[PDB]
Symmetry: D2
Subunit: 330 residues, 4 copies
C-alpha cells in the first residue's frame, strides 16, 4: 500500500473529466481560502459501524408489533414506526430503546481525520454520534458545538459545529433529538434559530455534501429551499456521491439542473460493490493531495502555482527572505 | 347467512360507525372520499405502471428493483425536466385513453345518495356512473370551476382530470405541483377543507400510508378537537390490522373500519370486502 | 323616495351593470353581504374609539392629545391587556358594549334584499335581532365549535366572534395579538369565509376605503388565478366623492366601487341617507 | 459634571450601559440604525415624499394628516396608476442631494461594532464608514450575500440606490413590504441570524416603525432563553410614561430613553442622541465608581482564571490588567 495508493491516485487524476477537475480546483481554492463548509450525513458515521436508523426501527417494530417488518422496510416507516411507539409505550420505553444502542464508545474513522484536514470554517452535521466532534478535539482545532437553540446565543468562537437534528450531549432523552415523525414535521417551528443558522452558513460558504444519498429527506428539504431562493444567488453546493453503482447520466442532469453539483466516487475508481471506505477515501485523498500539490507534473503547472502564490507581493518593493517561508506553508 | 349474523358480531365501535354513517346519509351530510383503490378495482391502470413506462423510456432498465416511496413522484420529474412535455402528454394519452366500465362500488356509492363526492382520482368513472344513474353532479376540477357551479352537489375533483385534453397541467401527478398544490389550487383546497369541516367524510379506497391521508391528518391535527368530527376510514387491506396502528390512527382522528375482521376474504379479492362493507352500510337503511 | 327616477338616468353604465348583476344574484340566491362597523354606528352603537379612549384614560391617565395613530387603535387595548390584566380588560367591555339599542331600517332592508348568507365583522346583535324579527332562520357561526353544529345551510357568519357566551375578551378578536393570531385560532371560520366569498357574489356595505379586513381579503383575492374569482362590489359611503385615480387602483385589484357622494349630495354626517339612497337603488331594481 | 451625571442613572441604565460596553469590547455588538439618524442633519424624510406623491396624484395638497397605512398606499397607488417612469423620476429628483455626515454616525462607528444593520437607503453610514477608515462589506441585494467580500456586514435591509435610483432596488411601496420574505429571503435570514447570535442595539427607531414590530413579532417564536433581548435607544422628546416601557420590556426590549437622562428641548434631537452616545462612549474607557464590594469583585473577575494556574510570574501581570 506504500506506492499503491500514490500511483493509483496519480493514474486516477490524470484521466478525470474536466468537470471533476474544475470541482477539485474550486474545492481546494475554497478550502485554502477559509471558506469551505462540510455537510457530513449518516453515511460517514456508518463507517465506524455506528448504530444505524434501520436497526433501531427494526427493534421498534419488533417491540411494538411483536415482530420485525416483513419484506421491504423502506416505505417512510422510518419516521412512522417510532412515532407510534412514542404514542403508545410513552417516554420511558423510547428512552430505553434510544440508550440501548446509542450509548457505545466507538473509535473514529480516518475519514473524519481527512475531513478535518481540509480546515473547514464550519461543519454542519446531522448524525447523532458524539465521536464526530471527538475527532475534532483530538487535533488542535476547536469547534463550538451548537445542538439546541440555547447554544446559538452562547457560542464563543466564529467556527460552528452544528447539530441540526440535535445530539445526546444533554443526556439520552428522546426530546433533544429529531427522530419521530412529529419532529421532522415540526422542525421549522421547534428549531427556528438552528434553521436560520443553517441557511446562513449555506448561503455564504462553499458547501460540500458527504455521507448522503440522492433522495434523502434532508437533501430534498435543502434543494426545495435552494430552488425557492433566487436565480444565481447561491454558490452551487458540491455533492459527493458514493453509491457503488455508477450514476446514470439522466439523474446527473436532473440533479445538476435542480441546483447541485455531483462528484460521483464510483466512476473515477473501478472498485468493488461494498467498498465504502475506499470510495470515500478516493475523493477525499484527491482533495487532500490537490491541497498539498501531489498532482503537479507539467512545468506550466509549477510556474502557475509559483505565480499564484507570489503575484500579490509584486506590488511590494522588497520582501525579507525569512518570511518567504510563510508564503509556501513552511 | 353470515351477513345477517354479522350484525351481532360487529364490535360496538363498528356498530356506532355504521349507525353514524347511516344517519349522515339520511341527513344529507355524507361525503365519500374515494381514491385509487376503487378505480383499480375496475381494472383501470395504476400509477406504478405509468412509473414503469416512464422509467423504461427514461433510464432504459426495467423497474430498477424495489421502488422507494419518493420514487413514485421523482421519475416523472426527471422525464419532464429533460425529455420535455410532448412525450409526457403522449404517454399519458396512450396509457389512459381507455374507458373502463364502472365497477359495482361506484354504483353503490351513488346508491347511498351522498351529499358530495370528493375524488382524488384522475378518471371519469364517477362522472359516467352519475350520468348513468341520472343524479346530476357539478364537476369541480380546476380553478375556473369553483366560481361557476349549477347546483350544490360538487363532484370535487381535487387532482384534476383529462377533460381539457390529455395534458400534464390539468392533472396533478408530478412533484412540483405536489409541493405547489396549495398555491396552484387554493380555491379547491379551501372548498375541500370546508366540506370536510361541515359534513361527515367516509374514506374509501385508501391505504393508511397514502400521501393525501397523511396531509389531511396534518391539517386535522391543528384543529380544535371539540370543533371537528372524526372522519371514517374504510381499510381494504387483505391482512388483519393490529391494535397499535388502530390506536395511532384513532387518536389522529380517523375512525378505522377493518374489512379484514368483518369478512374472511382472500388476499387478492378486493371486490369481495369492498362489496361486503358497502352492503353492510346499505342494509342498515 | 320621489327623486330616484332621475337618479336612474344620471347613473352611468358602471353602476347600472353592478345593480343588474346584484339583482340577478339576488334572484338566483347567490348574494352575500359583507357588512361591518359603519352601519353599526348609525344605531348610536358604541364604536371602538370610545373603548380605546377609556383604555387610554385608565392607562396613561390623560385624554388623547391629538388623533390616534392607525396602529394605536390596535395597540392601546393590547397595552391595557398586558399592563392591567384580563378582568380589568373585559370590565369595560362588560359595562360599555352591553347596551340595548334598536335596529335601524338599513339592517331590516339588508334582510329584505333576501341574501343567501350574511358575513359581518360587528360584535353586536343588531343583525341577529333583525333576523329574529323577520323570521329567516340563520345559523349563527361566531365561535369555532359552531361550525360543527350548523343546523341550517344559511350561515350568519360573524367572523370576529360574539358576546353570547359572555362579555369576555377571548370570545372577540380585539387585541393586536388576536388579529395576528387569527388563522391559527380560527381555521374553520376563515375557511368558511373564503369558500363563501369564492362560490358567491360578495357586496361590501358600510366600509371605509381602506381598513384591515378589506386589505387582507383583497390580498387573499390577489393570491389567486387572474379569473378564478368574481369581482366584489364596494359601496363607499364617505361624504366626499371618490377620486378617479384611486378608483382605478382599487378596481385593478379586483373590485367594483359604487359611491354615494357622487350619486347624491348630502351633509357631513347624515350617513342614514347615504346608505338609504344606494340601498333603494339596489332594492328597487 | 458628566461624572456625577453617570451617577444620576437608574440601575437598569447602569447595567445596560456596561453590558453594551462589554459587548463592544468583546466584538459582539451589532448596531441597528434606523430612520431618524439619517434625517438628523438634513436628509429628507418620507413625509414630504408622500406629500409630493399626493400632489402629483390627487391634484391638491394633502389635507389633514395621512394615516399610517397611507404612507405606503399613496406611493403604491401612484405607481399602479401613473407607472414606474414617474416614480423613478421623483425618486431620482429627491434622493440625489448629497448631505454631509453628522457626529452621531462617527460616535456609532467609534464603538467598533461587529456589524451594523440599517433600513436607510442612503449611504450616510456608508460614507462615514469609508471616511473614518473602517472596512465593511455592503450587503443590500441578494446577490451581494453570495459575493460577500469580508466578515463585517453593512446590511441595508430595505435596499439602497447604489445600482441606480430605481424603485425595484429599494423597499418603499406596499407590494415589496408585504412580499418581502418572497423577494429578499437571504438578507432576511442574515438579519435574523445576526440578531440571534450577537447583541443588537436599536438607534433612531421610535416604536412606530414596521421593522421594529416585525422583529418583535419574530421574537415571540424563539423559546425563552434562546434569545437575548435587544437594547433600545429611544430619543423621543417625551417621557416613556412607564407603562409602554413595561410592555416593551416584557416583549423583549430593554428601553433606554434620552428624555429621562437629560433635560433637552423638544427640537433637540441632536443633543438627545449625543447625550446617550457620549455617555455610552465614556463608559467604554472606565467603569463606574467602586466600593468595597465591587473592587474585590473586579479583582476576582480579573484574577479567578489565574487560580487554576499553579504560579504566574510578575512581569506579565500588566497584561492581565492591560497596562
Amino acid at each position: 500500500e506504500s506506492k499503491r495508493y500514490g500511483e493509483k491516485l496519480k493514474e486516477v487524476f490524470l484521466m478525470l473529466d474536466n468537470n471533476v477537475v474544475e470541482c477539485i480546483k474550486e474545492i481546494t481554492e475554497s478550502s485554502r481560502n477559509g471558506k469551505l463548509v462540510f455537510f457530513v450525513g449518516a453515511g460517514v458515521s456508518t463507517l465506524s459501524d455506528y448504530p444505524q436508523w434501520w436497526r433501531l426501527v427494526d427493534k421498534y417494530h419488533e417491540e411494538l408489533y411483536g415482530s420485525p417488518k416483513k419484506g421491504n422496510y423502506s416505505s417512510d416507516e422510518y419516521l412512522r414506526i417510532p412515532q407510534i411507539f412514542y404514542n403508545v409505550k410513552g417516554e420511558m420505553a423510547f428512552d430505553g430503546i434510544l440508550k440501548d444502542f446509542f450509548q457505545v464508545d466507538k473509535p473514529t474513522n480516518p475519514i473524519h481525520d481527512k475531513i478535518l484536514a481540509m480546515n473547514p470554517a464550519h461543519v454542519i452535521t446531522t448524525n447523532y454520534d458524539n465521536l464526530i466532534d471527538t475527532a475534532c478535539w483530538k487535533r488542535g482545532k476547536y469547534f463550538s458545538v451548537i445542538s439546541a437553540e440555547e447554544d446559538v446565543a452562547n457560542a464563543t468562537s466564529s467556527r460552528y459545529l452544528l447539530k441540526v437534528h440535535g445530539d445526546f450531549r444533554k443526556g439520552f432523552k428522546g426530546e433533544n433529538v429529531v427522530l419521530k415523525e412529529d419532529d421532522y414535521l415540526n422542525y421549522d417551528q421547534n428549531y427556528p434559530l438552528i434553521s436560520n443558522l443553517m441557511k446562513t452558513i449555506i448561503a455564504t460558504h462553499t458547501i460540500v455534501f458527504i455521507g448522503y444519498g440522492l433522495g434523502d429527506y434532508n437533501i430534498n428539504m435543502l434543494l426545495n429551499w435552494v430552488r425557492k431562493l433566487q436565480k444565481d444567488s447561491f454558490h452551487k453546493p458540491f455533492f459527493i456521491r458514493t453509491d457503488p453503482s455508477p450514476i446514470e447520466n439522466e439523474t446527473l442532469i436532473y440533479y445538476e439542473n435542480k441546483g447541485l453539483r455531483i462528484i460521483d466516487a464510483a466512476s473515477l475508481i473501478d472498485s468493488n460493490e461494498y467498498d465504502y471506505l475506499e470510495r470515500y477515501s478516493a475523493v477525499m485523498d484527491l482533495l487532500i493531495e490537490s491541497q498539498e500539490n501531489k498532482f503537479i507534473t507539467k512545468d506550466d503547472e509549477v510556474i502557475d502555482y509559483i505565480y499564484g502564490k507570489i503575484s500579490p507581493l509584486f506590488a511590494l518593493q522588497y520582501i525579507r527572505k525569512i518570511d518567504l517561508k510563510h508564503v509556501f506553508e513552511y
